[PDB]
Structures are given as structure tokens and as C-alpha cells.
């Protein structure tokens, strides 16, 4: 086959839905990836991409790549406002924005209830699901954004299980950000249910990717 060519972006910002990282390849069957590089190393929000190289060797030898909306914004988060989750570190035409594949939930009014969504993979293919765990810098950024100091995230699946927790700390300035935001991913097998459970600090999926390989 032919390699996939991204424009302006590495694999990080490309599949994260980073704005200003709009590839035009429209190829759904590439072999390996070729990435134009830049300053926001994909992650327009300072963070670490977990098992990145494991994801690089997954997004390779692809024979199908359907992108669907796993968690529709309009009908998925009633108790939390999907809007408002945008910062100036991820802009879109000089205006604060956010990754078009992830939704940054914050407390609605003054309450952040215990969210719990689940996708059961009606697709006949492996589904790539990405999410993010915000790590604020201050104990006040937590309460102001999530209202719960003792928050936790739990992404669970047949193939994957992990309980997350904020790591509040003043990080060195990067893009005017003293916080961080790690990103994760997993493969949901056909017919398996991936659970999400959080009371704060969950950057929730919006768009996933069904795919085959080889």
C-alpha cells in the first residue's frame, strides 16, 4: 500500500482530534504513517501519551478506518456541560477550543455527579477509544472545575482496567499551563463493553475508530 500522510500534525494531535491538525488524506487503508511535525507535539495541552509507541504500531497496516461518534455530545452528558471545556492552549483560529475527538467535562452549576457511560461495540471491528485524565495544578482549580477534591476515574473493560486519580501539582510553565493532561487508549473487542466511571477529571471520548489491520 502507501503510507498515510498527515498535514501539520503528528499521530498525537491527529487522532486526538487536535484542532489545527486536520489531515486531508481521506485514505482508509494505509500501511504506516508519515507525520509533518511542529511545536505542539500533537498534545496542545501539556501531557504524556501513554503507550504511544503501542498506539503507533497499532495505527499501522490498516485496512479499514471508520470514525464514529461513540458518545454523542448532545445526548450523553446531561448532568455535566459539554461546552465550557475549552482553553487557549488548544485554539481554533485564535479562539479557545479543544480536541474535536474528546469532550472536557466540568461541573454543571455547582455539582459534578457520578457519571457512568458504557459502549458495547456493535461494530464488527476493533474500536480505538481515546480519553484523557486532567491533572489540575492547584487544589482550587479542582473544586472550581470539579467541586470534588476526592475524585477518581475508572475506565474498565474486559481487556483493560485502571483506576485514575488527580495528581495536583504546580508543573513548570508550558504553553501557559501549570497543569497536565495525560491521554490513554485501548482496543475494545467486537462484542465487549467498555465502561466509564468518574466523578471529575475525565476528558471523555466523543469519537472512536473502528478498524481492521493487515
Amino acid at each position, epitope marked *: 500500500v502507501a503510507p498515510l500522510h498527515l498535514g501539520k500534525c503528528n499521530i498525537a494531535g491527529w487522532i486526538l482530534g487536535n484542532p*489545527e491538525c486536520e489531515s486531508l488524506s481521506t485514505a482508509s487503508s494505509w500501511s504506516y504513517i508519515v507525520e509533518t511535525p511542529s511545536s505542539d507535539n500533537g498534545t496542545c495541552y501539556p501531557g504524556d501519551f501513554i503507550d504511544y509507541e503501542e498506539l503507533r504500531e497499532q495505527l499501522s497496516s490498516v485496512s479499514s478506518f471508520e470514525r464514529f461518534e461513540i458518545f454523542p455530545k448532545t445526548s450523553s452528558w446531561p448532568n455535566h456541560d459539554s461546552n*465550557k471545556g475549552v*482553553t*487557549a*492552549a488548544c*485554539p*481554533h*483560529a*485564535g*479562539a*479557545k477550543s479543544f480536541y474535536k475527538n474528546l469532550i472536557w467535562l466540568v461541573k454543571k452549576g455547582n455539582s459534578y455527579p457520578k457519571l457512568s457511560k458504557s459502549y458495547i461495540n456493535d461494530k464488527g471491528k476493533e474500536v480505538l477509544v481515546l480519553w484523557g485524565i486532567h491533572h*489540575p*495544578s*492547584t487544589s482550587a*482549580d479542582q473544586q472550581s*472545575l470539579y467541586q470534588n477534591a476526592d475524585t477518581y476515574v475508572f475506565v474498565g473493560s474486559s481487556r483493560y482496567s485502571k483506576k485514575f486519580k488527580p495528581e495536583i501539582a504546580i508543573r513548570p510553565k508550558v504553553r*501557559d*499551563q*501549570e*497543569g497536565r493532561m495525560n491521554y490513554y487508549w485501548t482496543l475494545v473487542e467486537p462484542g465487549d463493553k467498555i465502561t466509564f466511571e468518574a466523578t471529575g477529571n475525565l476528558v471523555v471520548p466523543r469519537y472512536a475508530f473502528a478498524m481492521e489491520r493487515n
Partner: antibody, heavy 117, light 112 residues
Framework: QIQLVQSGPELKKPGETVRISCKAS????????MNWVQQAPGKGLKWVGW????????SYADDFKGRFAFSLETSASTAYLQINNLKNEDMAAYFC??????????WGQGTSVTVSS | DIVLTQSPASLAVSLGQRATISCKAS??????????LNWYQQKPGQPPKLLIY???NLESGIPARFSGSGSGTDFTLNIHPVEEEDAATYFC?????????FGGGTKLEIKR
């Protein structure tokens, strides 16, 4: 040399329509948004709206959803602000400004609109 | 809206002194430790000129005597010292929530 030039003044009787222009120069028109602000001397400033020159989706203030629109020309690099119908209100200057850092940096020439028969 | 305010309408500051303008928003125009507060200068017959953004960073090409500070809902604009070309009108504007809102605007007067 970033330039944002706006068409000259306009005098229209109440109830017609206007098509003000904003020409981008000295920078890439895409990758940056266009703000529009209404200035009436003494009465201060009011934020009309904002248009994402890539996605093309507009966002208006509550005082303009209905009679004000934003249209783009991207092949050529021009932004338009259309007003209709013109009550003798909105009697004020209109500036087109650029999005950069959630603020406005290179404001435009200026389009003094007058509404009288 | 997130209405801002004006403090003071006008103030006559002598040359070489410190002119302080401060404007207070009804809501908190902060988020994620970032304040979306901006300051503009508008000389008559000219479009507003960007001075400071977010809310302390000076725009490239603006003199150093301009300086902005604040967090939450209390912000300040500091001119140190004051020149004669600084005779204009200053506005404070937010970007935290739609719609964007401008302040009442402060018109500075030089005395000599």
C-alpha cells in the same frame, strides 16, 4: 504587514440592507477568526459576534441574532457583515478584528454607517 | 452576559506619574488558571489597539510602561510612567463566556 481594510462609509435609508467588507492581507485569512464590534461614540463598544474562518460556523451576541449575519469568501480572502433591516438604531461605526489569543489584535479600517432618508 | 465595569470614568494624571485603571467583572472570567482579560487603547478616530492579553502579557510592540495584573474578577491596568501620547480611551474586555463583553471604558487625561 497585516492589513484589515473595510469598505468606505455607507448611507442607506431605514429598512434597506448593507454588505460591509473586510479584506485580509499580510497573513493567512484561514487559521484565524474574524470578530466584529459596534462602536457608537460615548456609548462604548459592543461585541457583535465571531466567525470561525475555517469551520465557517458563526457565533453572535444575543442583541444581533436575527438581523445580523456573517458570510465568508475564502477563495478570495474577504469577510462580510450584513445588516437588515436597518432600524435607525445601529447608528455607529463597525470594526472587523482578528482572533489571535482570545483577544483582538489588528483591528480594521472602520465603516461608519448612517441610516437616514 | 458577564458585565464588566468602569473605575474611574476619567482621571487626570500628571506627566511622569502612575495612572491606575481597574475593572471588575460580575462573573469570574478565569478558567484552568488562565484569565481571559484583555485591555485596549482607542485614540479618537482610530480603531481600538490591543495592549495586554490574558491578563498580564504585553503585546509585542507595546511600550513596557503598560502593565496589567489581576485574577478572578478584579483586574488593573498600570501605566508607569505616563506620557502625552497616552491620551486616549481604555477598555477592558473578557473572553471567558459568550457573548464577549466590553467594559465601560476609561478616558485618560494629561495635565500640564
Amino acid at each position: 504587514q497585516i492589513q484589515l481594510v473595510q469598505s468606505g462609509p455607507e448611507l442607506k435609508k431605514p429598512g434597506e440592507t448593507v454588505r460591509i467588507s473586510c479584506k485580509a492581507s499580510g497573513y493567512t485569512f484561514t487559521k484565524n477568526g474574524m470578530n466584529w464590534v459596534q462602536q457608537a461614540p460615548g456609548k462604548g463598544l459592543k461585541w457583535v459576534g465571531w466567525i470561525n474562518t475555517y469551520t465557517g460556523e458563526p457565533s453572535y451576541a444575543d442583541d444581533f441574532k436575527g438581523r445580523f449575519a456573517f458570510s465568508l469568501e475564502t477563495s478570495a480572502s474577504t469577510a462580510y457583515l450584513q445588516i437588515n433591516n436597518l432600524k435607525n438604531e445601529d447608528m455607529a461605526a463597525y470594526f472587523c478584528a482578528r482572533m489571535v489569543r482570545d483577544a483582538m489584535d489588528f483591528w480594521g479600517q472602520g465603516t461608519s454607517v448612517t441610516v437616514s432618508s | 452576559d458577564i458585565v464588566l465595569t468602569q473605575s474611574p470614568a476619567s482621571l487626570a494624571v500628571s506627566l511622569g506619574q502612575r495612572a491606575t485603571i481597574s475593572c471588575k467583572a460580575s462573573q469570574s472570567v478565569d478558567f484552568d488558571g488562565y484569565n481571559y482579560l484583555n485591555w485596549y487603547q482607542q485614540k479618537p478616530g482610530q480603531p481600538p489597539k490591543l495592549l495586554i492579553y490574558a491578563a498580564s502579557n504585553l503585546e509585542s510592540g507595546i511600550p513596557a510602561r503598560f502593565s496589567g495584573s489581576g485574577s478572578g474578577t478584579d483586574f488593573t491596568l498600570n501605566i508607569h510612567p505616563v506620557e502625552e501620547e497616552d491620551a486616549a480611551t481604555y477598555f477592558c474586555q473578557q473572553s471567558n463566556e459568550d457573548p464577549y463583553t466590553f467594559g465601560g471604558g476609561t478616558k485618560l487625561e494629561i495635565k500640564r
